[PDB]
């Protein structure tokens with residue numbers, strides 16, 4: 001309402017419109033190559049900027065600060081796991097995907113295994129995973145921040161956001177979104193750094209964070225309701241392992257073996273096997289450019305600790321009776337939610353700490369985060385639908401109809417997400433961040449197991465790969481069923497879910513589900529007849545440098561030997577910086 | 587001390603990457 005906020009929002013919109021129009025003037029959007037794969041023309045800095053921007057949503061500010069506030073600094077685990085896994089994309093997965101000449105990841109499995117059915121299954125499962133784990137977090141986290149910072153209606157505002165992100169998406173092709181993601185990555189990091197600075201000034205620096213956070217409890221621990229009573233000292237006090245990434249393997253809220261192995265499996269699906277991330281690598285200029293952009297995205301994926309997690313811990317220090325509330329009546333008074341108020345962590349700091357001009361910039365940061373992420377989902381889902389499912393229903397389609405079907409899917413998945421918004425508004429507090437990471441851990445590991453055996457074990461065949469995936473979903477729903485039948489509650493109001501169902505952390509069941517899906521794939525593969533080498537050139541890690549004539553069930557990934565040496569050194573130095581920081585906060 | 591945990595972490599990482607070169611240098615060629 002102060003004019004400076006409107007001028008900052010207008011400036012940010014004019015940058016985004018300006019770079020959109022420049023990208024459409026530059027690139028060709030008339031063909032499937034151009035509109036869906038950016039012409040296979042993107043150099044390193046848009047690839048890095050877009051990998052980062054397509055990941056970092058409104059969820060990352062709401063969820064990481066909120067969980068920061070609630071549970072200390074182990075949530076950085078989610079971000080920092082990514083650092084290691086982006087190196088597996090650039091060096092192992094990205095080469096095979098370039099030599100296969102695929103537009104979608106289901107199409108890679110069609111080439112590797114060769115039935116009709118694996119491609120169809122993985123397309124339809126990916127569509128359900130994006131409605132559940134990716135749209136839901138962005139719509140929800142959007143809605144939190146609008147209700148807290150602005151107070152505007154969280155239905156109509158989500159419709160208006162979904163509406164503008166539709167137009168942003170359908171107007172340009174992957175080339176528009178990746179150049180716009182270099183503007184959005186600048187604003188996201190820039191404004192996030194300004195708020196980090198104001199926050200750290202208010203607690204009295206970095207020393208201030210680490211000497212005030214363990215004391216920072218609410219003074220209201222007594223309910224008016226009998227059979228809640230005195231809230232336990234366990235569940236309003238901050239956790240005594242709040243300053244440690246690496247927490248206890250049986251009693252930790254995120255056990256260290258589950259963090260490292262179990263997140264690597266679920267991060268493997270997210271970064272190496274999934275249409276949304278891998279489309280940025282399929283539109284690279286050359287493998288050297290992909291590897292270079294994977295290093296940039298890596299250094300950026302350290303930033304979220306210092307920009308989201310530690311700010312949310314500072315909100316606990318500054319507003320403990322509102323951010324760290326435990327009594328149901330008090331929490332219902334503060335932000336509407338009986339189960340807690342962690343979620344207001346990040347958007348209290350924007351309301352309280354930011355002056356007249358920079359409140360606008362922090363609105364532009366949330367907008368930048370949300371639009372980049374929802375557009376990347378709408379484009380990647382468009383590709384999945386068009387290329388895998390619509391080319392089934394119409395085989396002799398051609399590149400004019402396929403772009404129209406691409407554009408009409410973006411309209412349809414916006415309307416499905418509007419229909420879905422009330423189900424996601426049913427999530428009460430930080431239940432959604434926890435459930436997203438559960439769902440990911442119950443459906444992703446079989447896919448992680450298939451793409452690793454598809455890429456590294458040439459004996460694995462279509463019967464194995466398919467019944468591996470379906471056995472996977474049976475095991476994954478045996479837990480994704482029973483739990484959600486019980487509900488969630490809080491530490492104050494525990495759910496009645498049995499210990500033998502819920503006591504195993506979801507990231508440990510990721511490790512079990514991966515090895516059981518792995519073992520099933522290999523067993524059924526080794527029983528049934530194998531696929532010979534003539535079907536498999538440039539589709540497997542062994543044979544990415546083949547030159548032999550494949551029989552189907554620019555493919556040229558060499559490198560300026562000097563520039564190879566550059567990106568290889570920066571991979572090892574970027575892992576050294578990773579490893580140091582995991583040590584520092586262990 | 588946090589800084590020693592950092593340096594120990596790096597040290598162990600550089601041992602494992604030195605091993606990864608060693609193994610592929612002697613067992614792939």
Ligand SMILES: Cc1ccc([C@@H]2O[C@H](CO)[C@@H](O)[C@H](O)[C@H]2O)cc1Cc1ccc(-c2ccc(F)cc2)s1
Nearest residue numbers: 059060063064067078079082267270433434437440
């Ligand atoms: C909202 C969100 C959505 C997606 C991710 C990605 O998850 C992928 C895994 O499937 C990773 O591989 C990617 O590296 C990561 O960037 C991370 C966050 C940040 C969180 C807020 C809050 C979170 C949370 C809350 C409670 C928990 F118990 C655990 C996590 S997690």
Ligand code: NA
Nearest residue numbers: 053056372373
């Ligand atoms: Na984003």
